[PDB]
Amino acid sequence: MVTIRLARGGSKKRPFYHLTVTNSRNARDGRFVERIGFFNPVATGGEVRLSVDQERATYWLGQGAQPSERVAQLLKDA
Amino acid sequence: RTLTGRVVSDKMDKTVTVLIERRVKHPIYGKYVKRSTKLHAHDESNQCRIGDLVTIRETRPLAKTKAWTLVDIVER
Amino acid sequence: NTPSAKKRAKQAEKRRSHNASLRSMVRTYIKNVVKAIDAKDLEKAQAAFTAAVPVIDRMADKGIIHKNKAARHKSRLSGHIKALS
Amino acid sequence: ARYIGPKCKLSRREGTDLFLKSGARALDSKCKAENVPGQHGQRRGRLSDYGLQLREKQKVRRIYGVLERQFRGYYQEASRRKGSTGENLLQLLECRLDNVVYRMGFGSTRSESRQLVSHKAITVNGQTVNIPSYQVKAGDVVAVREKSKNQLRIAQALELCGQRGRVEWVEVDLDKKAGTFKSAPARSDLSADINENLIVELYSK
RNA sequence: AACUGAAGAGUUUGAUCAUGGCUCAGAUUGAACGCUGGCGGCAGGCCUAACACAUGCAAGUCGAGCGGAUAAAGGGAGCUUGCUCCUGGAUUCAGCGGCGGACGGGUGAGUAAUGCCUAGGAAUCUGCCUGGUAGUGGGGGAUAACGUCCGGAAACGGGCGCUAAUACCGCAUACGUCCUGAGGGAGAAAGUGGGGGAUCUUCGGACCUCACGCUAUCAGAUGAGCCUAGGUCGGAUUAGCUAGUUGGUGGGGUAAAGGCCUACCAAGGCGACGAUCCGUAACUGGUCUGAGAGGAUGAUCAGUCACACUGGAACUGAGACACGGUCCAGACUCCUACGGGAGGCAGCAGUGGGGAAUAUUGGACAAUGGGCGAAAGCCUGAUCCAGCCAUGCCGCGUGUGUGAAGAAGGUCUUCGGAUUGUAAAGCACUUUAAGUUGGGAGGAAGGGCAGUAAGUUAAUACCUUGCUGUUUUGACGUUACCAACAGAAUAAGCACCGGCUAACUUCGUGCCAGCAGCCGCGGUAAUACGAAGGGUGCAAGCGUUAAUCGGAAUUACUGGGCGUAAAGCGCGCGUAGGUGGUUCAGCAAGUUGGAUGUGAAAUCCCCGGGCUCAACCUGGGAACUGCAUCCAAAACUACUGAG
Asked: Which Gene Ontology terms of cellular component type are present (chain B) (predicted)?
């Protein structure tokens, strides 16, 4: 299956996720089909937490992309 | 995609051989050399002569080392 | 080791022995047709061809031979019966 | 690592005032700045041509208190920016926080301003900064923390502002002790003894 | 958003100009060693023996697939405090099954080629996902468990007897599937669970509905297999190499084109544009130097390939010729009742060995992810976190002010003094980090339970979904961070000082010991050896060694030379190849301009944004010089036609 899930970038104790669409049998930090947004939990000041783009998420979700548990709510809270 | 060369061989059976010249440039000295190319175009009717000027195109492989075919004979 | 690889080990010969019976049966009903061609037999091969088409295709949807392999014998063996006319 | 030791002795080799001692008592009375230091303080002659460029670079590097690992770091940010690396090298040494505390006049020496930053007594945007490398911007309201507004180190130093004047890119308020860094300096308030065409040429070869 | 840097010196000579070597100043490393040693962030840590391995752990999960045996609560009775039996039954897991172990983690042995990059295309496949479409009718024979017997030192093996399934196999039907020449012919399936109006009935059940699962098939994404063209290290003191070899035909074989394979036919194929052979090496996006052109190099991170003690081989399956699978042969350890067996850390730790040299037998599933079940849950040595090591980059401390009797004390001296030096001492203040005490976020999204509203329906029963209410969850952790208390207390070395090259004099030593990157010093006055004062460079580091690129216009495309410094074949003729006088005309292969597809993300660069700053993290752009397909222009080169 293909799936929409979260990567992990940044230092220790300061994460920064990436909404990628990947084949399911890959690594976390490995290859991907494309990337559509990010998610910053520790965003402070001028930083933006959610930055999903609704165009490609309209495209992939109509072709059987299967989201994760956190991405079940982040697309919902837009 | 369509190439052009001249025939050098008629020895095999339903199989012709072309020379495709080419001017590549040298990567560091800025000069256009000539370096050749020699294919095995699939002849079809055993009717080309040594010294022609023909036209080839690419198909699926027919034997091994023979994937190009013959479009048409341009000039003698 | 595991107590789960030793289960997939026992579960391999129970299918290896089972698939071999379903696989060799196909080949006996095909060699009956080919040995009947070589003796220039028109009606002997025609009877063997009739009762071997259902054996091949019923062994195709079980998943023993692939469905494009069963599509290949039926085309070629018809091409040798029309060459006896 | 700072420099802890004698401080007339640095002013005594380069042969200038250099503004290192604190009070307005006297130059060349605490110091005796007539000679090169050491035993052979009388013999002189023919500074080498390489030795002139190193003497100019070491002069600018001892006014402010940097070390060379930091100083080459400022030199990279000079050559990154657009145009006139000599002026840009100075304006990254003017915007540093231990300089601006000295320009406002919250200390006698420049090394006193380093200690007032280091003990969390200085704020920048309303929040505490204790780093003597903080590059301030245009319009940062440097103020003094209320727990130490009664220190005589700050009160006495404002009478030492009389022999200095205002540098006309700051403004200081002698009641609430809240300076305002107005804008960047120009290449007119800096003294002509420093040379922006010897330090740049030293870091080529 | 677009964007700039190029240094020289010493050494051949009585001296000079030139040619030409050598050596130094720079920035860098998975670095090692010597001296010295406060702190915290963010990083990295077997480059050598792919050399053997003690002991722990690294892939299992489903009782809403089916047997079986454990049988609670409770319903109890009875008998006299406890047992008896009964009744239901919640739990629980050895077995059959469905899935998954082909993903994730590790290492660089092999391979000089279509392996890997870039551009293309045609002959195929694809479990789980999405969109559809047509179904989900009936029937039979076995089998483990469990019995029981027999054999084995074990590791286990054998026999007879019994039972079930979504296990397995016929039969029935079928497009919108396969083959066929139209004509015609061939092929499937599995049920469990929540409910329930009516009705048949032991609501054993049928029944209706819902969720789930299964069977054909078309399309979409995703992954995979093939073919062409080009590029891809040194050696010419390696020049010929090859009979499935190179084509054709007939037949097989594989998901799929092909000498892939075979039977005859034919005598071809490649090669100085370097075949063949030898020697070494995993490639790539990138890193390190450079002004640039280039030159070396492929640690960590990412993509691709290749292996899993050595050599083979297939099965199972959607997809392996399979790191914790099977069979065989070999080598090597271990067990044994001597008959036979067992095992594979190039998974995480760890031991031995090698070596100039490289870390703890940690903590957890809370986070992000995977596998199974979607019902919660369960597994996870990949992940997220701690421990060790100045192994690197970036930041902060080791106090601040005043103070000349210019004190002792030291070294030198023309004996007058000079210098160490406001430096100390003395006096007045300051308390970050470290220490101590109190306080204290953010990483948490959910799940349970209850309620309610929507749509499913025959039945707002169940269930799905909004929402409400209530309750529960963190390895890190004594969290970052904040406040208070103590007091200047808790905290500086290392090389060098004749010239290149910043910085100097006395004392020992006398061709001895010794020094050294090059010039070269030392024979009794040494600014070069050994010390002492003084001084200069750098700092929590400083030095040497090893190794690349610069400087080297010293392999010169950008950017050199050949009368005498090294360098014009003894002279001809000439094949491949390189270059082409002059007018028109055509053409568009080069060439210029433009458009589209591509050039993975990271890295570098530019403008911003977050951590008290910076390193670090991160948003938007440019760039990736390329290759391909189209459109136009026609000066010059090419090709063509005429002079």
From this structure: cytosolic small ribosomal subunit
Question: Domain-by-domain residue ranges, chain B?
Answer: 1-76
Q: What is the CATH number for A72?
A: 3.30.1320.10
Angstrom distance (rounded) from CA A61 to CA A76: 13
The nucleotides of chain E lying under 7 Å from a protein CB are 4-7, 25, 38, 41-43, 59-61, 95-101, 103-105, 120-125, 127-130, 168-171, 178-181, 185-188, 215-217, 220-223, 227-231, 246-249, 251-260, 266-271, 273, 294, 301-304, 315-318, 324-326, 343-344, 367-371, 383-386, 394-404, 406, 418-423, 429-432, 442-446, 482-484, 492, 500-505, 533-540, 557, 577-578, 590, 600-601, 605-607, 609-613, 616-619, 629
Total domain count, chain A: 1
Per the listing, tokens 């195709």 go with C60
Among D118, D19, D16, residue whose Cα is nearest residue D64:
D19
The residue segments making up the domain with residue C57 are 1-85
Scored b (16 or more CB within 10 A) or e, B43-52 reads beeeebeeeb
